[PDB]
Amino acid sequence: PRIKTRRSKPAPDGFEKIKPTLTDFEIQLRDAQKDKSSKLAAKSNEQLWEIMQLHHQRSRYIYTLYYKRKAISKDLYDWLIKEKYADKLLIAKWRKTGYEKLCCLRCIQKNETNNGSTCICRVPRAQLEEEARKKGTQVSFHQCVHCGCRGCAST
């Protein structure tokens, strides 16, 4: 959510319904932004994931409102996108088949990953289980580094 200028087209009619929902998200983000001086590394990353997951949830909310629930108007949605309450790219990915669930965009860039391949969270849990069984071990991981993703839930 950006800052209201003269160049900001004001929010259309149906925004008054949703404001308090995404307001909460905003508040959370504010809470999630501060020097919570985690000496630890893993926990520090955890905080970051809290922001990431929160972002996902907010965007996911707007996506739901637009597409699954089919409630809010198109203009309103557009406005929201422009203001960036919800990430557009993420939504686009969601709309595409296979990524119906998707933590975030960073988990599907094969360039960034040292092995030219997606984030392990994208591997469906069942597959991982199968692999583990074959090997003998259990699910080695619980959440990837890029975001707090205990499975990315393609299924």
Added chain:
Amino acid sequence: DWDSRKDRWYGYSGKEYNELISKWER
């Protein structure tokens, strides 16, 4: 007359200072 031209404040009634008093008198 240098410091007169520099004078960040020059040629004014206290319109901004009356607004400070107004903000603090409140």
Added chain:
Amino acid sequence: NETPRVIEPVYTAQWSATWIAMRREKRDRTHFKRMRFPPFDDDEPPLSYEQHIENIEPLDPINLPLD
């Protein structure tokens, strides 16, 4: 990352408008408060954009009112 590009004549128009707006302001105002420099003291750190600025709304920019 973004490169700050502009339609040249449009850009000129914008600057022209600000030139006349600025000039107007100069005309009208009896005194013109300048900013004290530097803005912040050595004790005062770089204030967080989220904590102070992101809440408060900005003042109206300079642009001569058009018919």
Added chain:
Amino acid sequence: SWRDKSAKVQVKESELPSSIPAQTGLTFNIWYNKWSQGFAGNTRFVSPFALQPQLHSGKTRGDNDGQLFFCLFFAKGMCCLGPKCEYLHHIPDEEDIGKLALRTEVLDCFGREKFADYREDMGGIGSFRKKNKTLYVGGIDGALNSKHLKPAQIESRIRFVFSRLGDIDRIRYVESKNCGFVKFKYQANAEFAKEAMSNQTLLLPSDKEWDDRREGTGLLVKWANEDPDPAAQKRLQEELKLESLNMMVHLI
């Protein structure tokens, strides 16, 4: 048992201590995390925490995984990740030592690389060039806030402390040198203890200086040079020979 229960948190990250020790100097150095403009007085102090192993030890993320390394902060008794930690949380045993026996030649049970030489003190993590299992235990005078105890009392307390953390090959207190030599069953165990009782207190609740435990300077657990004593040298040699016989028969 440790394997029966999940590992409790040592201390929550709220309770954890900051990285700004003691203001030893006039100004803080950002890129070093040390202090500066003055090195007046000694740096070392006593650990606020200690590995109470039965109250703490347990399952982890690692015990699911087969992470082969133990938690330094477990040994220190200050791990802020309890069951969510990747590094393990229990006393090393024959099973786990055996499990990591390949890699542990090159590096510690805390998964950090050993070096060519001991750090001149014999103080830091061991050299790879020696397979030492023997910790020198200095600073007992400091570890008990100048408590005039008996040598027997000392050695017993020491025994109580290090026997808890690993299987002992032998211990012997030296009155004439005011120190310990605490040979362990395994190198992993030795490593574990050497951190687990670094900067710790030998004091107990029964002792009167219990609330002054923080204020002194902790145990100086370092590594031990082998004794000049030919009484043990011979034994060592014999052991080496025996081991050699094992491996040599194993080659064919």
